[PDB]
């Protein structure tokens, strides 16, 4: 099955093999397709095919009364009518079948994908919907004009929305673990808070299990355990800052005696519907305002060590042990001993 989209004039029609492009760090799925035009209608004109990318940065002041600044990260454009002789000479099986079926009315095109592009990730819409979304937009656009710099024609333009898709890796590493130690001037004895996960690689819909261990060598009594799952979503291009988006929280009231140990497995289940219509939440891209899941974690090569414009998604869980004795730092004061632990949540391809 392949996808098709026609112009309002009906003389231009673009056939693509698929809308979801699954890439990896090294291997990428290239963009291929054909464009059918009418040679007896588009006389003395030029038809071009481009793959474009854009970001629509949003601000709280801009949300009330502003125009969304659109910035193009990358833009590659090739000539499709008249055909360039320097283009790719062999055809793919898709392109071979489409050329054999349609004849000389259709012309093929291929595009490459650089490995330093952001995934198709958008932000949670507000209570009032502008009708224009916010996030990384990709499109394939074909157009016909006498002049390349004409940007006002609409009826001879065809645009299709595509999505950059990443798959969960099938080679998990060791179980992630973390430990923190807290000491105070008022109480020299250490408090050890350790937390570990059952797996490193998670699938969408899989709840998380954490083994929490507490070693209390002082006279303080543990009051509560707050386990918070957060999306550390960072955009390098907009600013040198990273948001700490709330995703899930679990407040357990299990107490621990002073100068004792404790070990307990907790289970957290990040329901999406709890985080409905919350600004700052990043989700996977979708077409025609359909339903979508949480944004998958972005895989980045360690060797490159380079920043990435757009939205970079990563998930970390923090275990805040809220402990208090009373009087040492204040009667109503408490110590929040917290440690973070990264995790990966993606969606499997097969």
């Amino acid at each position: 099955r392949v996808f098709k989209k026609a112009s309002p004039n009906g003389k231009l029609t673009v056939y693509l093999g698929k809308r979801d492009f699954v890439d990896h760090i090294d291997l990428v799925d290239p963009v291929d397709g054909v464009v059918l035009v009418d040679p007896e209608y588009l006389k003395e004109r030029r038809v071009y095919v481009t793959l474009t990318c854009a970001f629509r940065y949003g601000r709280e002041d801009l949300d009330v009364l502003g125009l969304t600044f659109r910035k193009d990260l990358f833009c590659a454009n090739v000539q499709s009518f008249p055909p360039a002789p320097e283009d790719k000479k062999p055809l793919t099986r898709l392109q071979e079948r489409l050329i054999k079926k349609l004849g000389e009315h259709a012309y093929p095109f291929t595009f490459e994908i650089p490995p330093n592009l952001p995934c198709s990730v958008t932000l949670q819409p507000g209570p009032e919907d502008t009708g224009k979304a916010c996030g990384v937009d990709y499109e394939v656009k074909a157009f016909c004009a006498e002049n390349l710099e004409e940007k006002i024609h609409k009826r001879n333009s065809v645009r299709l929305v595509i999505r950059k898709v990443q798959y969960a890796p099938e080679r998990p590493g060791p179980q992630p673990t973390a430990e923190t130690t807290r000491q105070f001037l008022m109480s020299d004895k250490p408090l050890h808070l350790e937390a570990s996960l059952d797996k490193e690689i998670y699938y969408h819909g899989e709840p998380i299990s954490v083994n929490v261990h507490v070693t209390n060598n002082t006279n303080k009594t543990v009051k509560k355990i707050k386990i918070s799952v957060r999306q550390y979503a960072d955009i390098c291009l907009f600013n040198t800052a990273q948001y700490k988006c709330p995703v899930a929280m679990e407040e357990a009231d299990d107490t621990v005696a002073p100068s004792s140990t404790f070990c307990k497995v907790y289970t957290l289940t990040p329901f999406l519907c709890n985080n409905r219509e919350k600004r700052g939440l990043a989700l996977d891209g979708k077409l025609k305002h359909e339903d979508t899941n949480l944004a998958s974690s972005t895989l980045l090569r360690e060797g490159a060590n380079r920043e990435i414009l757009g939205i970079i998604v990563s998930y970390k869980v923090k275990v805040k042990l809220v402990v208090s004795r009373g009087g040492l730092l204040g009667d109503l004061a408490s110590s929040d001993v917290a440690v973070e632990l990264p995790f990966t949540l993606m969606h499997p391809k097969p």
């Epitope: 699938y203 819909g205 899989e206 289940t269 519907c273």
Partner: antibody, heavy 119, light 109 residues
Amino acid sequence: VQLVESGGGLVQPGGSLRLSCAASGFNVYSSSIHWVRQAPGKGLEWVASISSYYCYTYYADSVKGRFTISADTSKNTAYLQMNSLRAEDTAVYYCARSRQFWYSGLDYWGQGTLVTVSS
Amino acid sequence: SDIQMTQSPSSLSASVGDRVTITCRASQSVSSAVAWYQQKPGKAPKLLIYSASSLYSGVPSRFSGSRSGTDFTLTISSLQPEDFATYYCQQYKYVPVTFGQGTKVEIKR
């Protein structure tokens, strides 16, 4: 993984009941829960669906206004409360589980329970 | 989006090893969301065919099929004695969810 329907049998029209669907070997956060019914002499038709991760509940047109459903995610147990019973509700009810991340269709099945609505 | 799915025939006679072709024609365009299930008498149904081309895991290779327009054909290259059950076609794309009529495979005598 097991799916066990419970709560069937002989009931009266105009009454009410609770049909449960116990589950083991999975979590409802990874799946969508569907209820279908087989009338005597007829095939399977959809009744209701719950999507736990999306938190979206859908109802057939024939059961809107009379039936309701919830689910216990800590026990993975579906709880369909039926009210305003009629004679055409006599059927074999199947509780089924589908994958949410990819719509593979019906995947996990129970054996279903027979409900007979007669005075 | 009520799609009328006409399954044909309602019953057919065949012998062991014959190629059985059962059609299911939708009233509206169903591009890929085609599934086929097999139900035994007194037993829960199982999933046989999914997305009109993919064979479900655990299903023997003798079950296949193809789509032309809105009409899907389920093909059994070698009919088995344990396959003498009821077959259902199903769509899973549009709301409400619709279903077939049921084809029972009988022994040709």
